[PDB]
Amino acid sequence: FEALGIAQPKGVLLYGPPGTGKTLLARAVAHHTDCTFIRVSGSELVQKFIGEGARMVR
């Protein structure tokens, strides 16, 4: 993509029902990549860093 001369999508929205297994597959892309799974909900689910990662953009 850097070669073609584009700028790579920042954002990806998946949308539809939460019980057509859309959610299950979304997470399956994370298992398949071996990405670290950082979950942010705009609530402090257990995230430790300063103690939130929902103010943590940069």
Partner: protein, 385 residues
């Protein structure tokens, strides 16, 4: 001019040579620095020893004492140690304390936080200046406000006005409002701090105005500066109802930015370029003339402006005769700069689906449909026209 350079140099030669000359020579001859000079080096080094607890200097008290709050869970009203100076401990900096008995041995660290790291954003953009075509007038307006007093403040403060600050970027979204701040920023060579307006309201209680202070304070220290505040429109539009800080949070944040901007503070060299959708959807507290001298309203981009932007993207893209610029521009209506960017980015992506590393007239024609719908869509408008 040249003669001046010799004078400035004159202070500096004496500063390095004197410090070198005095330390070694004076311990050697009579008793001037001598026993006293060793004594300061040694005492501080022994007291400091192993370990040292880190603390932060909250305040300095005038009676050879200070309020340090230590990173061990206990605060201290320390006593100064012999041969350490009270008045070299900055309120910006954290100080090091001997951890056996609490006294300031010294400052080896100023320490660093993740809080700093948000304000400081480094830019080295793919599109910059002379990668934007058309809407030539709009760039000149920005510069008279931001660039000219920032470079040479001397007349502007001197005449009697406070320097004209900033610009407000509103009109049809997509004109290329974001490209413009980043591009003008390189030309002036101002330190570019980017912070979102929605990021300032967050779960934490009382952290919200403190962060806004930091944003301004850091911009000022950096020296020439522009603060591009992206999506500031966000505080106003939404009463979020998802923050534990609540409606209280939104109130207190909104005031602090005003305070830090001018206020009674009246900080200088800090231009704010505000990106908004519209300033009719923006919060009425924030908006008010006379903090931002000039407001620019972009017109709807025409067919003409559009060609110049596309020639640049064609140069950045794979080169062929199968790139057909004109056709895509013509078909579309009087609509944003963003679309020219969107047609090019979707066209490359589209190619990958095929199992082709080519971007041809076919990828473009498919791209024209999706970009046009998403952005505003012509088939509603055709009836009303």
């Amino acid at each position: 001019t040249q003669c001046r350079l010799k004078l400035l140099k004159l202070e500096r030669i004496k500063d390095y040579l004197l410090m070198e000359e005095e330390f070694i020579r004076n311990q050697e001859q009579m008793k001037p620095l001598e026993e006293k000079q060793e004594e300061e080096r040694s005492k501080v080094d022994d007291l400091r020893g192993t370990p040292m607890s880190v603390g932060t200097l909250e305040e300095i008290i005038d009676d050879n004492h200070a309020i340090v709050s230590t990173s061990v869970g206990s605060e201290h009203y320390v006593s100064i140690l012999s041969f350490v100076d009270k008045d070299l401990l900055e309120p910006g900096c954290s100080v090091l304390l001997n951890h056996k008995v609490h006294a300031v041995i010294g400052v080896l660290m100023d320490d660093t936080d993740p809080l700093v790291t948000v304000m400081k954003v480094e830019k080295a953009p793919q599109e910059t200046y002379a990668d934007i075509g058309g809407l030539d007038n709009q760039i000149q307006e920005i510069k008279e406000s931001v660039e000219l007093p920032l470079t040479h403040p001397e007349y502007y403060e001197e005449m009697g006005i406070k320097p004209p600050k900033g610009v407000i970027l509103y009109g049809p979204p997509g004109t290329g409002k974001t490209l413009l701040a980043k591009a003008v920023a390189n030309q002036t060579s101002a330190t570019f701090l980017r912070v979102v307006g929605s990021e300032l309201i967050q779960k934490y209680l009382g952290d919200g105005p403190k962060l806004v202070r930091e944003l301004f304070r850091v911009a000022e220290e950096h020296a020439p500066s522009i603060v591009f505040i992206d999506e500031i429109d966000a505080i106003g539009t939404k009463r979020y109802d998802s923050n534990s800080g609540g409606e209280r949070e939104i109130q207190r944040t909104m005031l602090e930015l005003l305070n830090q901007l001018d206020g009674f503070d009246s900080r200088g060299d800090v231009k704010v370029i505000m990106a908004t959708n519209r300033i009719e959807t923006l919060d009425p507290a924030l908006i008010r003339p006379g903090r931002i001298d000039r407001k620019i309203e972009f017109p709807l981009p025409d067919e003409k402006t559009k060609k110049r932007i596309f020639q640049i993207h064609t140069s950045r893209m794979t080169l062929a005769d199968d790139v057909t610029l004109d056709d895509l521009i013509m078909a579309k209506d009087d609509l944003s700069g963003a679309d020219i960017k969107a047609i090019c980015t979707e066209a490359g992506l589209m190619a990958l689906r095929e199992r082709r590393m080519k971007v041809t007239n076919e990828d473009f024609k498919k791209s024209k449909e999706n970009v046009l719908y998403k952005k505003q869509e012509g088939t509603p408008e055709g009836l009303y026209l």
